[PDB]
Amino acid sequence: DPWQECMDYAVTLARQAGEVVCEAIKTATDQKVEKMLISSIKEKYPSHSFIGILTDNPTWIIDPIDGTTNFVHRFPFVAVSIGFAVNKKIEFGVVYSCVEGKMYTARKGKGAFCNGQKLQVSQQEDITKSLLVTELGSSRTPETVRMVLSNMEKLFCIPVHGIRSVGTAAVNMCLVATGGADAYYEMGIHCWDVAGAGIIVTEAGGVLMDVTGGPFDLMSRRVIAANNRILAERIAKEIQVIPLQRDDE
């Protein structure tokens, strides 16, 4: 199988990059690591594409430091994220939370793992009994911020059990995969923030969905990553779509 060789190599790279990012903690680092990752992959697979518009070509979708604010603050959640898409479909994902030393991996059809341990999403379907994760965002536009908090307020209007935030899209999503959280939602993310972790959620038995309710669009700047379709749709139903410039357009 060809793509299994790519994954083994990607896990090697993600750990190599993670150690570099965590050494730095112990920005210039982000450029330094992305160049290293792209150069490494190009030296082994020179016919592949990269993002940091998606064609059917084997493509590497890289976020060398997911959680840049965390990185600056030494807040213990900083991730290296690598997603691999063939025929516009994610085939495997790698998310290495380096401070945690947690290597999240998932291959299409083979399930999702954290450091060799099988991951399964939670069973919860009642949004009233649900724990969510999200990020407030990097935009400070009063109109956007109001929308973000209103959605958060609306979800607190419903008696949800709670809302958490570790400052990382990929790790927030990985926490859904472990079952620790029931669902994740955010508007303002980019494809490189979620391409690695999306497949880890779905291979944990989760679902990816657009906040409109429709199918998850990798370039929409929007994502719901839930444990099941029931909880995802309820979230989509309750929050309001925020207009934002698409990744391809």
Place this chain on the structure above:
Amino acid sequence: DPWQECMDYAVTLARQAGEVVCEAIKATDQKVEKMLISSIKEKYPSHSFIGILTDNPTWIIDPIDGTTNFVHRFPFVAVSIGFAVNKKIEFGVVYSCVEGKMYTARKGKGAFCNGQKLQVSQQEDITKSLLVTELGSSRTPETVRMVLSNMEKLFCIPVHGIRSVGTAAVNMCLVATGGADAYYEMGIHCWDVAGAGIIVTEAGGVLMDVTGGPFDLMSRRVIAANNRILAERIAKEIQVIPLQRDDE
């Protein structure tokens, strides 16, 4: 030091409690609560417990800080122990059992996580600061609106960001490490903050009321920051939420 025997004993008790709490994650609140109280009473029969504060040696305990997290296996669940003599916190112990991080601090002797010394951050500019907070378990219309309002006001200053791991004690301990610059919340209780408060100040941080005045342990309010300048900027922007006190 007579209270050093108390602290050594308290750390062992916390880890034991944490072992039981995490084991069930892989009723519990009652078991651990009874475990701790019956253990300290058998060693120190005349000490007080809270979970009103006299000069008497008093243990302020939270057997499971992060109840929601516990139910959801969200990997932040703490055992918090504060110990007060003469109405002032002498030592504090916070054990985050999922991540196996034992936070400890004795007044005057510094703050530690797994025997590794802690130091708060240097940041004084609030627009370059990372805050931690908690939206609380309260679903009161007047409260929830004011909570998100206060958060909006701080987020629009703007701050570098806001985080939430779902535990007052662990949020505060993250301030002690330097990973976060400040913690704030209204709606907490003395037992949520008694253990972590001294860990912040021994890491070099400050405790403060949202009014800008001295920290009041029974007031339901708290700002645990790296320094006075950052704490006061937070107090300045925050609207005080009315709540019944712990000693009322």
